[PDB]
Amino acid sequence: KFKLVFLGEQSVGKTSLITRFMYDSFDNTYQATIGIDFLSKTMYLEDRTVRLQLWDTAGQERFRSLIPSYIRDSTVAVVVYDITNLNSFQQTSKWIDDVRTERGSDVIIMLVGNKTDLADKRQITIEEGEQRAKELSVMFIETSAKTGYNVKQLFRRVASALLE
Ligand SMILES: Nc1nc2c(ncn2[C@@H]2O[C@H](COP(=O)(O)OP(=O)(O)O)[C@@H](O)[C@H]2O)c(=O)[nH]1
Ligand SMILES: [Mg+2]
Numbered sequence: 634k635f636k637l638v639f640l641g642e643q644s645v646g647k648t649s650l651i652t653r654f655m656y657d658s659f660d661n662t663y664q665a666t667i668g669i670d671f672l673s674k675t676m677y678l679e680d681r682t683v684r685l686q687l688w689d690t691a692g693q694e695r696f697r698s699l700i701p702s703y704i705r706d707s708t709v710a711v712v713v714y715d716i717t718n719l720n721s722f723q724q725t726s727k728w729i730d731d732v733r734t735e736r737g738s739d740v741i742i743m744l745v746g747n748k749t750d751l752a753d754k755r756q757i758t759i760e761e762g763e764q765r766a767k768e769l770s771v772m773f774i775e776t777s778a779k780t781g782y783n784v785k786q787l788f789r790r791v792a793s794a795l796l797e
Pocket of ligand 1: 650660
């Protein structure tokens with residue numbers, strides 16, 4: 634089962650990463666997510682096809698109580714932060730804890746540093762993100778939904794982990 638849940642503070646880029654993968658497009662305008670939405674996409678990898686189910690969650694504190702149910706049901710948790718926002722990175726500990734609380738070790742977690750295109754506003758180094766992922770035993774990658782940088786690789790890697 635290939636069910637991915639996207640977690641992270643508001644404005645880090647969860648929706649944009651999903652949209653970039655789904656339709657290979659990006660919108661600079663912000664469109665806050667309401668509740669939890671579901672999207673599906675079949676992708677290719679390792680001589681086969683995999684049906685991915687994506688669950689985009691809203692970071693607003695008022696939708697918080699609806700997330701645990703989705704996390705429990707997901708085989709992959711993509712925890713996203715904004716490389717230019719220190720708070721968003723610090724908050725990944727909250728999200729990862731929520732995931733572990735629901736799935737323990739029976740889950741694939743990918744920590745994502747998004748918005749790498751905003752290099753002149755970077756607050757978290759790539760090494761700091763890599764080390765945080767290593768210490769928490771989760772996977773790591775940096776992306777830019779805006780340019781598309783590493784977005785397909787993000788999904789390729791999580792799907793590969795699932796097939797393994
Ligand atoms: N520069 C830049 N902006 C981004 C990137 N990803 C998302 N954004 C912008 O950041 C804002 C929030 O994006 P959104 O996908 O709604 O984030 P979400 O709240 O986590 O779902 C929007 O204005 C996006 O256009 C990125 O990689 N680079
Ligand atoms: Mg969103």
